[PDB]
C-alpha cells in the first residue's frame, strides 16, 4: 500500500541519517585511542600525564583526553568500583593498551602489584592487549636504596644473586645500587610478562617520577610500537 511505502521511505530516510551520524562517529572512534589506566591506591597513576591534558570526571570513571602529535588518546581510570575486578575488566578488550602504573618504592606491596600484573597479563581477553608498564616514583627508590633503612633482599630473595643487565642504560644521576634495584623490579615484571604470554602482546617498561612531563611522549611511542607490531604480526613478519 501507499501508506506502508511512505512509512518505509521515512524509516529508510531516518536510517540514512543515522548511518551518516555513525560514519562521523566511526571516524572519531577510530581516530581516538583507548588506554586503560590501572594501578594501586598508593601509586601515582593520576599524576602520570602532566601537561597538555583535559580531565573529565564521570560518577564512576575518570577520563583523560590528551593529544600528542595530532593523535587523540582517551585514558580511562576505573576508581569507583569494588575490589573484585574479574568481570568489568572484560569490557576493556577493545583498548589499544593498558597503562599499568606500579609504585616501585613500596616494597611490601610490590608483590601485590606483580600479582596484579600476572592477572592482567594472563587474562584470556587481554592476550591481544599490550601493557605499558610505568614504574613510578623513581626518586623515592633512589632515596630508599641509598638510605639503607629498608632491605629489598628481605622482600625478594632473588635480588642477592641478581646482576645488572648489559642492555640496561643507567641515567647520569644514578648509582650502581639504585640501578640494581630499579632494573631488578623491571626484570621481575618482564619475567612475568615474557614467561607465560604469547607473541600477541608485549610489556613496555618505563621509569617515571612524580614530576615528569615526558610521559605522554612515552605513551605515544609505545602505542605507535603496539600498532606497528600488530601490523607486522598481521603481515606474518613477526
Amino acid at each position: 500500500t501507499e501508506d506502508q511505502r511512505n512509512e518505509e521511505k521515512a524509516q529508510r530516510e531516518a536510517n540514512k541519517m543515522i548511518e551518516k551520524q555513525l560514519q562521523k562517529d566511526k571516524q572519531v572512534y577510530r581516530a581516538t585511542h583507548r588506554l586503560l589506566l590501572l594501578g594501586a591506591d598508593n601509586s601515582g597513576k593520576s599524576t602520570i600525564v602532566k601537561q597538555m591534558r583535559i580531565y573529565h570526571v564521570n560518577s564512576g570513571i575518570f577520563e583523560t583526553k590528551f593529544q600528542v602529535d595530532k593523535v587523540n588518546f582517551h585514558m580511562f581510570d576505573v576508581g569507583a568500583q569494588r575490589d573484585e575486578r574479574r568481570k568489568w575488566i572484560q569490557c576493556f578488550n577493545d583498548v589499544t593498551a593498558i597503562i599499568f602504573v606500579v609504585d616501585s618504592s613500596d616494597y611490601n606491596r610490590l608483590q601485590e602489584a606483580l600479582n596484579d600484573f600476572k592477572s592482567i597479563w594472563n587474562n584470556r581477553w587481554l592476550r591481544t592487549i599490550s601493557v605499558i608498564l610505568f614504574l613510578n616514583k623513581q626518586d623515592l627508590l633512589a632515596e630508599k636504596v641509598l638510605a639503607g633503612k629498608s632491605k629489598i633482599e628481605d622482600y625478594f630473595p632473588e635480588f642477592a644473586r641478581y646482576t645488572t643487565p648489559e642492555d640496561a642504560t643507567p641515567e647520569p644521576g644514578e648509582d650502581p645500587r639504585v640501578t640494581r634495584a630499579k632494573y631488578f623490579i623491571r626484570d621481575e615484571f618482564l619475567r612475568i610478562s615474557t614467561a607465560s604470554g604469547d607473541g600477541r602482546h608485549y610489556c613496555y617498561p618505563h621509569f617515571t617520577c612524580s614530576v615528569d612531563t615526558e610521559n605522554a611522549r612515552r605513551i605515544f611511542n609505545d602505542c605507535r610500537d603496539i600498532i606497528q607490531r600488530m601490523h607486522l604480526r598481521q603481515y606474518e613478519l613477526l
Binding site: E84, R85, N115, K118, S119, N122, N123, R124
Partner: peptide
C-alpha cells in the same frame, strides 16, 4: 581461582571474595 582451565586470578586478594 574463578574460572576453570585458566591462568588468570584477578581478585583472589580482595576484601570480599
Amino acid at each position: 581461582c574463578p574460572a576453570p582451565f585458566t591462568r588468570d586470578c584477578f581478585d583472589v586478594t580482595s576484601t570480599t571474595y
